[PDB]
PDB file of C-alpha atoms in Angstrom:
ATOM      1  CA  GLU A   1      20.013 -38.042 149.026  1.00  0.00           C
ATOM      2  CA  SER A   2      19.141 -36.730 145.580  1.00  0.00           C
ATOM      3  CA  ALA A   3      22.483 -37.678 144.076  1.00  0.00           C
ATOM      4  CA  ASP A   4      21.810 -41.275 145.078  1.00  0.00           C
ATOM      5  CA  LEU A   5      18.406 -41.123 143.624  1.00  0.00           C
ATOM      6  CA  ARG A   6      19.898 -40.141 140.277  1.00  0.00           C
ATOM      7  CA  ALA A   7      22.452 -43.017 140.532  1.00  0.00           C
ATOM      8  CA  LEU A   8      19.527 -45.343 141.129  1.00  0.00           C
ATOM      9  CA  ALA A   9      17.627 -43.940 138.029  1.00  0.00           C
ATOM     10  CA  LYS A  10      20.675 -44.360 135.944  1.00  0.00           C
ATOM     11  CA  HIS A  11      21.233 -47.963 137.131  1.00  0.00           C
ATOM     12  CA  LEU A  12      17.588 -48.764 136.293  1.00  0.00           C
ATOM     13  CA  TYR A  13      17.835 -47.222 132.869  1.00  0.00           C
ATOM     14  CA  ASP A  14      20.972 -49.141 132.085  1.00  0.00           C
ATOM     15  CA  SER A  15      19.469 -52.401 133.118  1.00  0.00           C
ATOM     16  CA  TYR A  16      16.201 -51.636 131.136  1.00  0.00           C
ATOM     17  CA  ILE A  17      18.518 -51.221 128.094  1.00  0.00           C
ATOM     18  CA  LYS A  18      20.108 -54.558 128.911  1.00  0.00           C
ATOM     19  CA  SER A  19      16.821 -56.427 129.314  1.00  0.00           C
ATOM     20  CA  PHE A  20      14.623 -54.935 126.630  1.00  0.00           C
ATOM     21  CA  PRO A  21      15.779 -55.287 123.056  1.00  0.00           C
ATOM     22  CA  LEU A  22      13.075 -52.997 121.668  1.00  0.00           C
ATOM     23  CA  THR A  23      12.939 -49.753 123.534  1.00  0.00           C
ATOM     24  CA  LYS A  24      10.473 -46.875 123.267  1.00  0.00           C
ATOM     25  CA  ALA A  25      13.162 -44.749 121.529  1.00  0.00           C
ATOM     26  CA  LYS A  26      13.681 -47.467 118.897  1.00  0.00           C
ATOM     27  CA  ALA A  27       9.898 -48.017 118.488  1.00  0.00           C
ATOM     28  CA  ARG A  28       9.098 -44.493 117.946  1.00  0.00           C
ATOM     29  CA  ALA A  29      11.743 -44.054 115.316  1.00  0.00           C
ATOM     30  CA  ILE A  30      10.226 -47.026 113.403  1.00  0.00           C
ATOM     31  CA  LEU A  31       6.722 -45.792 113.966  1.00  0.00           C
ATOM     32  CA  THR A  32       7.484 -42.151 112.712  1.00  0.00           C
ATOM     33  CA  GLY A  33       9.752 -43.488 109.912  1.00  0.00           C
ATOM     34  CA  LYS A  34      13.032 -42.015 111.205  1.00  0.00           C
ATOM     35  CA  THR A  35      15.255 -45.013 110.984  1.00  0.00           C
ATOM     36  CA  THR A  36      17.574 -46.494 108.504  1.00  0.00           C
ATOM     37  CA  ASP A  37      16.312 -50.107 109.050  1.00  0.00           C
ATOM     38  CA  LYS A  38      13.742 -51.640 106.529  1.00  0.00           C
ATOM     39  CA  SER A  39      10.193 -50.450 106.960  1.00  0.00           C
ATOM     40  CA  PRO A  40       8.010 -52.849 108.894  1.00  0.00           C
ATOM     41  CA  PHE A  41       5.546 -55.087 106.817  1.00  0.00           C
ATOM     42  CA  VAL A  42       2.076 -53.664 107.331  1.00  0.00           C
ATOM     43  CA  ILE A  43      -0.742 -56.102 108.067  1.00  0.00           C
ATOM     44  CA  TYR A  44      -4.026 -54.473 107.549  1.00  0.00           C
ATOM     45  CA  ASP A  45      -6.322 -57.236 105.986  1.00  0.00           C
ATOM     46  CA  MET A  46      -6.357 -60.982 105.429  1.00  0.00           C
ATOM     47  CA  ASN A  47      -4.328 -60.792 102.170  1.00  0.00           C
ATOM     48  CA  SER A  48      -1.636 -58.802 103.813  1.00  0.00           C
ATOM     49  CA  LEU A  49      -1.675 -61.059 106.875  1.00  0.00           C
ATOM     50  CA  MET A  50      -1.078 -63.999 104.513  1.00  0.00           C
ATOM     51  CA  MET A  51       1.707 -62.136 102.572  1.00  0.00           C
ATOM     52  CA  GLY A  52       3.453 -61.126 105.844  1.00  0.00           C
ATOM     53  CA  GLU A  53       3.134 -64.276 108.014  1.00  0.00           C
ATOM     54  CA  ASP A  54       6.759 -65.058 107.284  1.00  0.00           C
ATOM     55  CA  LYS A  55       8.365 -61.585 107.976  1.00  0.00           C
ATOM     56  CA  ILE A  56       6.447 -61.941 111.416  1.00  0.00           C
ATOM     57  CA  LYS A  57      -5.699 -72.906 112.032  1.00  0.00           C
ATOM     58  CA  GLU A  58      -8.422 -70.157 112.087  1.00  0.00           C
ATOM     59  CA  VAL A  59      -6.948 -66.625 111.808  1.00  0.00           C
ATOM     60  CA  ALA A  60      -8.136 -65.103 115.063  1.00  0.00           C
ATOM     61  CA  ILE A  61      -6.674 -68.217 116.896  1.00  0.00           C
ATOM     62  CA  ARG A  62      -3.379 -68.049 115.031  1.00  0.00           C
ATOM     63  CA  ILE A  63      -3.007 -64.361 115.993  1.00  0.00           C
ATOM     64  CA  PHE A  64      -3.985 -65.237 119.622  1.00  0.00           C
ATOM     65  CA  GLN A  65      -1.214 -67.922 119.756  1.00  0.00           C
ATOM     66  CA  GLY A  66       1.451 -65.551 118.375  1.00  0.00           C
ATOM     67  CA  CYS A  67       0.386 -63.032 121.073  1.00  0.00           C
ATOM     68  CA  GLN A  68       0.970 -65.671 123.733  1.00  0.00           C
ATOM     69  CA  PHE A  69       4.463 -66.547 122.607  1.00  0.00           C
ATOM     70  CA  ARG A  70       5.491 -62.778 122.530  1.00  0.00           C
ATOM     71  CA  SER A  71       3.930 -62.471 125.897  1.00  0.00           C
ATOM     72  CA  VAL A  72       6.094 -65.420 127.258  1.00  0.00           C
ATOM     73  CA  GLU A  73       9.209 -63.622 125.835  1.00  0.00           C
ATOM     74  CA  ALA A  74       8.164 -60.452 127.594  1.00  0.00           C
ATOM     75  CA  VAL A  75       7.612 -62.219 130.955  1.00  0.00           C
ATOM     76  CA  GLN A  76      11.215 -63.472 130.693  1.00  0.00           C
ATOM     77  CA  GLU A  77      12.633 -59.987 129.831  1.00  0.00           C
ATOM     78  CA  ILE A  78      10.612 -58.435 132.611  1.00  0.00           C
ATOM     79  CA  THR A  79      11.944 -61.103 135.140  1.00  0.00           C
ATOM     80  CA  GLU A  80      15.529 -60.318 134.227  1.00  0.00           C
ATOM     81  CA  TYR A  81      14.832 -56.568 134.563  1.00  0.00           C
ATOM     82  CA  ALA A  82      13.160 -57.141 138.052  1.00  0.00           C
ATOM     83  CA  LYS A  83      16.286 -59.060 139.218  1.00  0.00           C
ATOM     84  CA  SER A  84      18.437 -55.909 138.427  1.00  0.00           C
ATOM     85  CA  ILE A  85      16.170 -53.765 140.843  1.00  0.00           C
ATOM     86  CA  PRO A  86      18.449 -53.381 143.897  1.00  0.00           C
ATOM     87  CA  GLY A  87      16.938 -55.487 146.788  1.00  0.00           C
ATOM     88  CA  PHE A  88      14.695 -57.598 144.621  1.00  0.00           C
ATOM     89  CA  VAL A  89      16.795 -60.800 144.450  1.00  0.00           C
ATOM     90  CA  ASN A  90      17.314 -60.856 148.189  1.00  0.00           C
ATOM     91  CA  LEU A  91      13.539 -60.992 148.817  1.00  0.00           C
ATOM     92  CA  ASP A  92      12.101 -64.252 149.736  1.00  0.00           C
ATOM     93  CA  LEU A  93      11.721 -66.249 146.565  1.00  0.00           C
ATOM     94  CA  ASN A  94       7.911 -66.784 147.177  1.00  0.00           C
ATOM     95  CA  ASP A  95       7.521 -62.926 147.211  1.00  0.00           C
ATOM     96  CA  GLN A  96       9.595 -62.445 144.063  1.00  0.00           C
ATOM     97  CA  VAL A  97       7.215 -64.954 142.281  1.00  0.00           C
ATOM     98  CA  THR A  98       4.177 -63.243 143.739  1.00  0.00           C
ATOM     99  CA  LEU A  99       5.357 -59.708 142.641  1.00  0.00           C
ATOM    100  CA  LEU A 100       5.943 -61.032 139.075  1.00  0.00           C
ATOM    101  CA  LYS A 101       2.746 -63.092 138.898  1.00  0.00           C
ATOM    102  CA  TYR A 102       0.586 -60.098 139.720  1.00  0.00           C
ATOM    103  CA  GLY A 103       2.828 -57.444 138.076  1.00  0.00           C
ATOM    104  CA  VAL A 104       3.955 -58.769 134.805  1.00  0.00           C
ATOM    105  CA  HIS A 105       0.699 -57.997 132.823  1.00  0.00           C
ATOM    106  CA  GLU A 106       0.665 -54.433 134.002  1.00  0.00           C
ATOM    107  CA  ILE A 107       4.247 -54.109 132.799  1.00  0.00           C
ATOM    108  CA  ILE A 108       3.359 -55.717 129.500  1.00  0.00           C
ATOM    109  CA  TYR A 109       0.581 -53.327 128.877  1.00  0.00           C
ATOM    110  CA  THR A 110       2.859 -50.321 129.851  1.00  0.00           C
ATOM    111  CA  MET A 111       5.510 -51.489 127.492  1.00  0.00           C
ATOM    112  CA  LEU A 112       3.110 -52.301 124.639  1.00  0.00           C
ATOM    113  CA  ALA A 113       2.047 -48.704 124.697  1.00  0.00           C
ATOM    114  CA  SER A 114       5.543 -47.843 123.606  1.00  0.00           C
ATOM    115  CA  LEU A 115       4.969 -49.945 120.439  1.00  0.00           C
ATOM    116  CA  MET A 116       1.452 -48.464 119.610  1.00  0.00           C
ATOM    117  CA  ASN A 117       0.085 -45.395 118.030  1.00  0.00           C
ATOM    118  CA  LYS A 118      -3.575 -44.715 117.389  1.00  0.00           C
ATOM    119  CA  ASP A 119      -3.500 -46.646 114.162  1.00  0.00           C
ATOM    120  CA  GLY A 120      -1.703 -49.905 115.107  1.00  0.00           C
ATOM    121  CA  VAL A 121       0.902 -51.836 117.044  1.00  0.00           C
ATOM    122  CA  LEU A 122       4.421 -52.892 116.151  1.00  0.00           C
ATOM    123  CA  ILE A 123       5.012 -56.729 116.231  1.00  0.00           C
ATOM    124  CA  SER A 124       7.829 -59.168 115.823  1.00  0.00           C
ATOM    125  CA  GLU A 125      10.617 -56.854 117.125  1.00  0.00           C
ATOM    126  CA  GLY A 126       9.371 -54.018 114.990  1.00  0.00           C
ATOM    127  CA  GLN A 127       9.436 -56.072 111.618  1.00  0.00           C
ATOM    128  CA  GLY A 128       5.684 -55.894 111.404  1.00  0.00           C
ATOM    129  CA  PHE A 129       2.849 -53.494 112.093  1.00  0.00           C
ATOM    130  CA  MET A 130      -0.658 -54.644 112.621  1.00  0.00           C
ATOM    131  CA  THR A 131      -3.516 -52.201 112.209  1.00  0.00           C
ATOM    132  CA  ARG A 132      -5.833 -51.377 114.976  1.00  0.00           C
ATOM    133  CA  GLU A 133      -8.773 -51.714 112.562  1.00  0.00           C
ATOM    134  CA  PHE A 134      -7.592 -55.119 111.360  1.00  0.00           C
ATOM    135  CA  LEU A 135      -7.357 -56.263 114.913  1.00  0.00           C
ATOM    136  CA  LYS A 136     -10.968 -54.782 115.412  1.00  0.00           C
ATOM    137  CA  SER A 137     -12.112 -56.811 112.357  1.00  0.00           C
ATOM    138  CA  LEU A 138     -11.499 -60.232 114.005  1.00  0.00           C
ATOM    139  CA  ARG A 139     -14.555 -62.338 114.973  1.00  0.00           C
ATOM    140  CA  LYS A 140     -15.924 -61.961 118.381  1.00  0.00           C
ATOM    141  CA  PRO A 141     -14.638 -62.033 121.136  1.00  0.00           C
ATOM    142  CA  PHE A 142     -11.050 -61.781 119.682  1.00  0.00           C
ATOM    143  CA  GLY A 143     -12.056 -58.459 118.000  1.00  0.00           C
ATOM    144  CA  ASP A 144     -12.295 -56.850 121.353  1.00  0.00           C
ATOM    145  CA  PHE A 145      -9.095 -58.097 122.945  1.00  0.00           C
ATOM    146  CA  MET A 146      -6.747 -55.403 122.008  1.00  0.00           C
ATOM    147  CA  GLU A 147      -9.009 -52.335 121.931  1.00  0.00           C
ATOM    148  CA  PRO A 148      -8.717 -51.596 125.672  1.00  0.00           C
ATOM    149  CA  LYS A 149      -4.895 -51.608 125.292  1.00  0.00           C
ATOM    150  CA  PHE A 150      -5.085 -49.164 122.439  1.00  0.00           C
ATOM    151  CA  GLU A 151      -7.367 -46.940 124.446  1.00  0.00           C
ATOM    152  CA  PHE A 152      -4.895 -47.077 127.424  1.00  0.00           C
ATOM    153  CA  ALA A 153      -1.907 -46.477 125.188  1.00  0.00           C
ATOM    154  CA  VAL A 154      -3.219 -43.391 123.417  1.00  0.00           C
ATOM    155  CA  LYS A 155      -3.745 -41.634 126.707  1.00  0.00           C
ATOM    156  CA  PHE A 156      -0.582 -42.954 128.300  1.00  0.00           C
ATOM    157  CA  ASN A 157       1.453 -42.040 125.357  1.00  0.00           C
ATOM    158  CA  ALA A 158       0.235 -38.395 125.646  1.00  0.00           C
ATOM    159  CA  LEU A 159       2.265 -38.110 128.894  1.00  0.00           C
ATOM    160  CA  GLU A 160       5.392 -38.311 126.574  1.00  0.00           C
ATOM    161  CA  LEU A 161       7.434 -40.566 128.950  1.00  0.00           C
ATOM    162  CA  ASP A 162      10.852 -41.677 127.759  1.00  0.00           C
ATOM    163  CA  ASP A 163      12.674 -44.844 128.434  1.00  0.00           C
ATOM    164  CA  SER A 164      14.478 -43.379 131.496  1.00  0.00           C
ATOM    165  CA  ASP A 165      11.125 -42.485 133.076  1.00  0.00           C
ATOM    166  CA  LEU A 166       9.553 -45.876 132.040  1.00  0.00           C
ATOM    167  CA  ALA A 167      12.470 -47.754 133.714  1.00  0.00           C
ATOM    168  CA  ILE A 168      11.628 -46.318 137.107  1.00  0.00           C
ATOM    169  CA  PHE A 169       7.800 -46.384 136.664  1.00  0.00           C
ATOM    170  CA  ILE A 170       8.150 -50.092 135.825  1.00  0.00           C
ATOM    171  CA  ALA A 171      10.239 -50.816 138.948  1.00  0.00           C
ATOM    172  CA  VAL A 172       7.661 -49.046 141.073  1.00  0.00           C
ATOM    173  CA  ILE A 173       4.886 -51.290 139.840  1.00  0.00           C
ATOM    174  CA  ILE A 174       6.912 -54.448 140.263  1.00  0.00           C
ATOM    175  CA  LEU A 175       7.729 -53.616 143.817  1.00  0.00           C
ATOM    176  CA  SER A 176       3.940 -53.404 145.011  1.00  0.00           C
ATOM    177  CA  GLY A 177       3.559 -54.353 148.605  1.00  0.00           C
ATOM    178  CA  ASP A 178      -0.196 -54.926 148.295  1.00  0.00           C
ATOM    179  CA  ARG A 179      -0.079 -58.035 146.071  1.00  0.00           C
ATOM    180  CA  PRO A 180      -2.110 -60.978 147.555  1.00  0.00           C
ATOM    181  CA  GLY A 181      -0.031 -63.538 149.525  1.00  0.00           C
ATOM    182  CA  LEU A 182       3.112 -61.598 150.081  1.00  0.00           C
ATOM    183  CA  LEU A 183       4.818 -63.003 153.145  1.00  0.00           C
ATOM    184  CA  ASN A 184       7.258 -59.901 153.968  1.00  0.00           C
ATOM    185  CA  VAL A 185       5.655 -56.682 153.006  1.00  0.00           C
ATOM    186  CA  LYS A 186       7.966 -54.220 154.801  1.00  0.00           C
ATOM    187  CA  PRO A 187      11.120 -54.861 152.689  1.00  0.00           C
ATOM    188  CA  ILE A 188       9.052 -54.478 149.534  1.00  0.00           C
ATOM    189  CA  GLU A 189       7.414 -51.153 150.654  1.00  0.00           C
ATOM    190  CA  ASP A 190      10.925 -49.863 151.747  1.00  0.00           C
ATOM    191  CA  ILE A 191      12.284 -50.600 148.231  1.00  0.00           C
ATOM    192  CA  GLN A 192       9.172 -49.064 146.583  1.00  0.00           C
ATOM    193  CA  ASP A 193       9.361 -45.960 148.756  1.00  0.00           C
ATOM    194  CA  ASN A 194      12.911 -45.276 147.466  1.00  0.00           C
ATOM    195  CA  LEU A 195      11.807 -46.005 143.874  1.00  0.00           C
ATOM    196  CA  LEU A 196       8.898 -43.636 144.329  1.00  0.00           C
ATOM    197  CA  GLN A 197      11.335 -40.809 145.513  1.00  0.00           C
ATOM    198  CA  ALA A 198      13.474 -41.587 142.466  1.00  0.00           C
ATOM    199  CA  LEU A 199      10.565 -41.382 140.134  1.00  0.00           C
ATOM    200  CA  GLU A 200       9.407 -38.082 141.560  1.00  0.00           C
ATOM    201  CA  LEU A 201      12.864 -36.568 141.113  1.00  0.00           C
ATOM    202  CA  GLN A 202      13.228 -38.050 137.634  1.00  0.00           C
ATOM    203  CA  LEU A 203       9.937 -36.500 136.469  1.00  0.00           C
ATOM    204  CA  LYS A 204      10.879 -33.054 138.014  1.00  0.00           C
ATOM    205  CA  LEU A 205      14.139 -33.049 136.307  1.00  0.00           C
ATOM    206  CA  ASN A 206      13.202 -34.611 132.880  1.00  0.00           C
ATOM    207  CA  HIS A 207       9.717 -32.955 132.545  1.00  0.00           C
ATOM    208  CA  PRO A 208      10.149 -29.604 134.367  1.00  0.00           C
ATOM    209  CA  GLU A 209       7.160 -28.050 132.653  1.00  0.00           C
ATOM    210  CA  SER A 210       4.715 -31.054 133.052  1.00  0.00           C
ATOM    211  CA  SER A 211       2.644 -30.206 136.137  1.00  0.00           C
ATOM    212  CA  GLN A 212       1.558 -33.037 138.297  1.00  0.00           C
ATOM    213  CA  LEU A 213       3.138 -35.690 136.101  1.00  0.00           C
ATOM    214  CA  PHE A 214       3.929 -37.846 139.065  1.00  0.00           C
ATOM    215  CA  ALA A 215       0.237 -37.709 140.335  1.00  0.00           C
ATOM    216  CA  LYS A 216      -0.748 -38.709 136.824  1.00  0.00           C
ATOM    217  CA  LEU A 217       1.549 -41.706 136.763  1.00  0.00           C
ATOM    218  CA  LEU A 218       0.277 -42.810 140.214  1.00  0.00           C
ATOM    219  CA  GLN A 219      -3.190 -42.852 138.768  1.00  0.00           C
ATOM    220  CA  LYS A 220      -2.000 -44.863 135.665  1.00  0.00           C
ATOM    221  CA  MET A 221      -0.854 -47.478 138.047  1.00  0.00           C
ATOM    222  CA  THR A 222      -4.412 -47.708 139.379  1.00  0.00           C
ATOM    223  CA  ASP A 223      -5.768 -47.848 135.760  1.00  0.00           C
ATOM    224  CA  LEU A 224      -3.333 -50.605 134.936  1.00  0.00           C
ATOM    225  CA  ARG A 225      -4.736 -52.824 137.631  1.00  0.00           C
ATOM    226  CA  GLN A 226      -8.243 -52.284 136.212  1.00  0.00           C
ATOM    227  CA  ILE A 227      -7.156 -53.131 132.790  1.00  0.00           C
ATOM    228  CA  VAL A 228      -5.531 -56.313 133.868  1.00  0.00           C
ATOM    229  CA  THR A 229      -8.632 -57.284 135.873  1.00  0.00           C
ATOM    230  CA  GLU A 230     -10.776 -56.747 132.713  1.00  0.00           C
ATOM    231  CA  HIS A 231      -8.287 -58.685 130.626  1.00  0.00           C
ATOM    232  CA  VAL A 232      -8.399 -61.665 133.028  1.00  0.00           C
ATOM    233  CA  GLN A 233     -12.154 -61.636 132.531  1.00  0.00           C
ATOM    234  CA  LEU A 234     -11.963 -61.662 128.749  1.00  0.00           C
ATOM    235  CA  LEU A 235      -9.745 -64.688 129.085  1.00  0.00           C
ATOM    236  CA  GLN A 236     -12.096 -66.516 131.231  1.00  0.00           C
ATOM    237  CA  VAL A 237     -14.511 -66.326 128.317  1.00  0.00           C
ATOM    238  CA  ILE A 238     -12.063 -67.762 125.876  1.00  0.00           C
ATOM    239  CA  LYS A 239     -11.787 -70.985 127.885  1.00  0.00           C
ATOM    240  CA  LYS A 240     -15.474 -71.354 128.064  1.00  0.00           C
ATOM    241  CA  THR A 241     -16.373 -70.741 124.492  1.00  0.00           C
ATOM    242  CA  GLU A 242     -13.189 -71.581 122.442  1.00  0.00           C
ATOM    243  CA  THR A 243     -11.454 -75.058 122.182  1.00  0.00           C
ATOM    244  CA  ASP A 244      -8.095 -75.667 120.414  1.00  0.00           C
ATOM    245  CA  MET A 245      -7.329 -72.837 122.898  1.00  0.00           C
ATOM    246  CA  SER A 246      -4.803 -73.698 125.537  1.00  0.00           C
ATOM    247  CA  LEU A 247      -2.342 -71.251 126.967  1.00  0.00           C
ATOM    248  CA  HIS A 248       1.321 -71.712 126.924  1.00  0.00           C
ATOM    249  CA  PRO A 249       2.518 -73.462 130.268  1.00  0.00           C
ATOM    250  CA  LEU A 250       4.207 -70.209 131.574  1.00  0.00           C
ATOM    251  CA  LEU A 251       0.945 -68.352 131.073  1.00  0.00           C
ATOM    252  CA  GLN A 252      -1.120 -71.002 132.682  1.00  0.00           C
ATOM    253  CA  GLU A 253       1.049 -70.912 135.764  1.00  0.00           C
ATOM    254  CA  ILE A 254       0.849 -67.191 135.911  1.00  0.00           C
ATOM    255  CA  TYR A 255      -2.958 -67.080 135.235  1.00  0.00           C
ATOM    256  CA  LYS A 256      -3.757 -69.928 137.770  1.00  0.00           C
ATOM    257  CA  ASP A 257      -5.388 -68.350 140.821  1.00  0.00           C
ATOM    258  CA  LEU A 258      -4.739 -64.816 139.380  1.00  0.00           C
ATOM    259  CA  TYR A 259      -7.636 -62.530 140.239  1.00  0.00           C
TER     260      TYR A 259
ATOM    261  CA  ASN B   1       6.905 -72.951 150.241  1.00  0.00           C
ATOM    262  CA  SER B   2       3.461 -72.752 148.767  1.00  0.00           C
ATOM    263  CA  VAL B   3       3.803 -70.089 146.136  1.00  0.00           C
ATOM    264  CA  UNK B   4       7.088 -71.602 145.216  1.00  0.00           C
ATOM    265  CA  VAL B   5       5.601 -75.028 144.792  1.00  0.00           C
ATOM    266  CA  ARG B   6       2.801 -73.717 142.417  1.00  0.00           C
ATOM    267  CA  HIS B   7       5.153 -71.742 140.151  1.00  0.00           C
ATOM    268  CA  UNK B   8       7.884 -74.206 138.815  1.00  0.00           C
ATOM    269  CA  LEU B   9       8.571 -72.158 135.708  1.00  0.00           C
ATOM    270  CA  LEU B  10       8.770 -68.673 137.321  1.00  0.00           C
ATOM    271  CA  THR B  11      10.976 -70.162 139.887  1.00  0.00           C
ATOM    272  CA  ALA B  12      13.378 -71.478 137.299  1.00  0.00           C
ATOM    273  CA  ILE B  13      13.510 -68.137 135.489  1.00  0.00           C
ATOM    274  CA  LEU B  14      14.117 -66.205 138.717  1.00  0.00           C
ATOM    275  CA  UNK B  15      16.902 -68.601 139.965  1.00  0.00           C
TER     276      UNK B  15
END
């Protein structure tokens, strides 16, 4: 049993490396300045935003549109990673779509934390760094969009997960049997139960001194759902007070009848 | 299928 759970963990890590160009290991090196690559361009005010718009009409709207296109790319990367989880492509296609529709924003926020520190977030494949204070400086309601993600990220990053832990954590979230409208829950729960046993063993071996880390990650799964619920609400305000504000077609499809 | 019909783009990416 345990040897097979390590082979599953390794498969997921290898698939995560294939699916996600900017890993946590690569992001932390950039953020702490321990890489040979050119330093990211720092965006901390409007003048620096203008200067760096090329290395990466109203400003808050332009930032929100770039957020959308990055989110679309992330949905596609997350979908390829999901298709690498053993058993996932043999699920009913309706259920694959439902798991991704309800799971991809929880995964986006998990993986965004890998690009964040308390002072800002890496953007454009690590070629830019936007400060948390600058995001706070945007006019309402856009100035509150990112702050809940930074708050989540600071506490999540304190758990010191690596990419090998994250690969299994993300798979567990995708294979959630309680999403609304799933047609065949038992095969999903069977895959998830095996992923949960792999995650427990991964954290016992990789974080032997981190007591109750598994329970803490289960609770982060709950927290991520609440984050996403709150995010969906903020978006419902954008469409009732902001014009020139239409979501990309892939995001429209995901958000339609979402929560 | 009803979900499939409402998610043309996610279906294309999954396929």
